[PDB]
A paper describes a structure:
The γ-TuRC has a helical shape consisting of 14 spokes, each containing a copy of γ-tubulin presented by the C-terminal gamma ring protein 2 (GRIP2) domain of one of five paralogous γ-tubulin complex proteins (GCPs). The GCP proteins interact via their N-terminal GRIP1 domains in a specific order: the γ-TuRC core harbors four pairs of GCP2/GCP3 (spoke 1–8), followed by a sequence of vertebrate-specific paralogs GCP4/GCP5/GCP4/GCP6 (spoke 9-12) and finally another pair of GCP2/GCP3 (spoke 13-14).
We, therefore, subjected the NEDD1/N-GCP3/MZT1 density segment to focused refinement (see “Methods”), improving local resolution for NEDD1 to 4-5 Å. After optimizing the model by another round of MDFF into the density obtained by focused refinement, resolved bulky hydrophobic side chains and the length of resolved alpha-helices confirmed the density segment as NEDD1. In addition to direct interaction with NEDD1, the N-GCP3/MZT1 modules also share an extensive interaction surface with each other, suggesting cooperative binding of N-GCP3/MZT1 modules to NEDD1.
Numbering used by the authors:
A (entry chain J): 207 to 329
B (entry chain S), E (entry chain Q): 9 to 117
C (entry chain U): 597 to 671
D (entry chain s): 8 to 66
F (entry chain q): 10 to 65
G (entry chain W): 621 to 671
H (entry chain R): 6 to 103
I (entry chain r): 7 to 65
The structure:
């Protein structure tokens, strides 16, 4: 069946949930998030485990490539065409959720300018 | 129709080509039951409900747009089942509002 | 009369929205009815397989039969 | 084939605006079943149980 | 009471006497399960309702005609529960501008 | 009595564009006279018509 | 009003199902029972035609 | 820990006034009910829920207590530990009593 | 952290009391933890009423 | 309570048993399903709703008479919960 | 029993106005059921359904 063939030769989908999900690697410091989550869940009596879009480690740098020059991004929320920001559910397994937010927020604000500068282009 | 509903089950789950047998068996049951839909046929009546729904999520520009799309839709093909598709979509609409909870811990209860 | 119909038009709008809320509930009701019966059959279906008959025993009658034919094909 | 594709494309425009949140392929199946006679209410119900079932499974 | 129901099933559907089975099991069960009446012995609301129905079907003429035949039923003095047959007709009304679902081999879906 | 009534009822059904048979209405008078709730009478027959559709 | 019908239905299903499961087991006979029927059948055959 | 399963048992144990293993039979029944879906009457807008609670206070002839409730609401908003305030608020509203 | 959760509890607890409740502080804590963990508000409300009712029949 | 439920069941079908075991078991089933009252200890309104129903059936003379009968019960001051029995009469109205 | 009967006469009359047949005996039993704090909603569901069963049958 063709659907199954695509699913193996293309990396598993992360804009729609209908593809199974990796966030494993044999190094001990790369499963950091599973360890960090566990800690929060036992220390804090009131912890809210988010519904997290599992990403797909170091493919966040491909979305930094597109974002800095190229097209509007419909994988991440942009409130308007002069305000680029990064959804609060993106996790990479070899960092914390919060730690992750912080590198993606630097490039978001640097892609805010090139995207704004692109709306000035009158063909 | 057996093939079409089985393929429907496999596609949505994104996988399971004879493991979605249980879900399938249910779907065959629901469809085999009967309904009496409040509003039956007639194209005007369904278009009116869709516009109200558009206004309510505050998507006005979309309500105006859709109406052109409806006239266009007709022109491209004419059915007696036109209404059933438009009512189907209507019921199957999704609200933008709220988070749709967790599923990453809601599975366990 | 104008004001009589004014009130009249306001109430249809409000009643229609109300129909939809009630309808959604009725449709949620149906999802639960049919799904519960489907569960019941699966539970009943397995329980009934195990204690109404042993598949294990019957396979063993057929085996013994086969062992005895093979014994007689060795004389 | 020409006629059919052109209703679907108009049909996919509405679906993305109205916030159906279904896929292209799946919608074609919904439409074929209607033309062959199905009840709409039952059909949305089935879609819904399947949809919820997929999310829970992945996590 | 049973004999009546069997005659409704067998007759309309034709003689399987085992392929009209479905309706018959269905029939005894549905009537035996008690509920308290609604739209009963208030024939004034029912006449008005069928007149609106006619008005809707774009047959104003049929509503005055109906009213004449209605009064003809009263004088005969037969048929204890008039309302129940009227109630039945209205449920299955349809407008001359569409037609409700007809499909067969519905089990496959 | 049953027949006389069936003809007037047959006139009404034809106006509504709703098909019922001659026979159905006559059986209906029998059920009413034994006592039947209005909801029930309608519901058995509505389903029986749809069954006939699927069947053929 | 709707909620009340929904929650009662499900209570009736769980209760009835549990009571049904015990009952089914009673007339059909559990695995202990099948094995012990065979023991008595061996014994009886042995007195009548292996003695 | 605080897995759903472990928390639902503790709730049942205290409310029924019976031991942990002696509330089991009701414990199973409790899992079916929660795993059967419902949808709230109010689905959209955090405000739609709050105004309802506020209307309820008046109805019960306790106008003063609804003022106090507004004040508490600000407190809850500022601490930010919870991200589904609405669920908690709809739930107490439903279990309201005289 | 310990302080902050207490205050979060404290405010909710004040609201529960105004509205009249039969839940204690311990049970109320459990409910919130359920809220955070998902769980539509109607299912929770229902399971509570059935369990409250069964306790009265027993005692 | 259990035997008071069994007595009631025998009396409505006609005095003396004649395979009414099933009917008692069925009522045990009903009473174990939790229903939920719409109003509780608001006996006055339950009288008012009865009267609105009697105008609804076009049986207004019965509706004047009922008022006297409830007022009778009010004077006697019998304890059982007056609201409980009236709520029974409303369902059958 | 004398007090229970006196009440029972008052309920028998009310029962005539709505036009429902009930035995005198059943009307006394209802009184015991609400004194014990039985749920009136379950109670009504019993009365409705068994009286109706009796009439349709006969």
């Amino acid at each position: 069946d063709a659907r199954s063939w695509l699913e193996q030769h293309i990396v598993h989908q992360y804009w729609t949930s209908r593809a199974p999900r990796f966030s494993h690697s044999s190094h001990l410091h790369s499963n950091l998030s599973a360890i960090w989550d566990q800690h929060l869940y036992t220390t804090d009596p009131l912890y809210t485990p988010d519904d997290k879009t599992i990403v797909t480690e170091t493919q966040v740098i491909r979305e930094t490539l597109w974002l800095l020059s190229g097209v509007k991004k419909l994988l991440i929320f942009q409130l308007n065409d002069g305000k680029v920001n990064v959804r609060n559910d993106i996790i990479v397994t070899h960092m914390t959720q919060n730690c992750l937010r912080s590198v993606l927020e630097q490039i978001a604000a640097y892609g805010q300018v090139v995207f704004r500068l692109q709306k000035f282009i009158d063909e | 129709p057996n093939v079409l509903l089985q393929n429907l089950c496999c596609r949505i789950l994104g996988k399971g080509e004879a493991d979605v047998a249980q879900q399938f068996q249910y779907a065959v049951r629901v469809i085999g039951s009967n309904f009496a839909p409040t509003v039956e046929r007639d194209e005007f009546l369904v278009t009116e409900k869709i516009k109200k729904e558009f206004v309510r999520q505050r998507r006005e520009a979309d309500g105006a747009l859709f109406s052109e799309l409806h006239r266009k839709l007709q022109s491209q093909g004419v059915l007696k089942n036109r209404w059933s598709i438009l009512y189907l979509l209507l019921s199957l609409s999704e609200d933008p509002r709220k988070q749709p909870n967790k599923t990453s811990s809601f599975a366990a209860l | 009369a104008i004001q009589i119909n004014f009130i009249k038009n306001m109430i249809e709008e409000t009643l229609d929205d109300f129909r939809e809320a009630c309808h959604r509930d009725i449709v949620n009701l149906q999802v639960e009815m049919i799904k519960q019966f489907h569960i019941q059959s699966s539970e009943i279906q397995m329980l009934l397989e195990r204690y109404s008959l042993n598949e294990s025993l019957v396979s063993e009658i057929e085996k013994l039969r086969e062992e005895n034919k093979r014994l007689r094909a060795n004389f | 084939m020409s006629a059919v594709r052109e209703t679907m494309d108009v049909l996919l425009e509405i679906s993305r605006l109205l916030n159906t949140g279904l896929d292209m392929e799946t919608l074609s199946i919904c439409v074929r079943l209607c033309e062959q006679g199905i009840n709409p209410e039952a059909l949305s119900s089935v879609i819904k149980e399947l949809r919820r079932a997929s999310d829970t499974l992945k996590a």
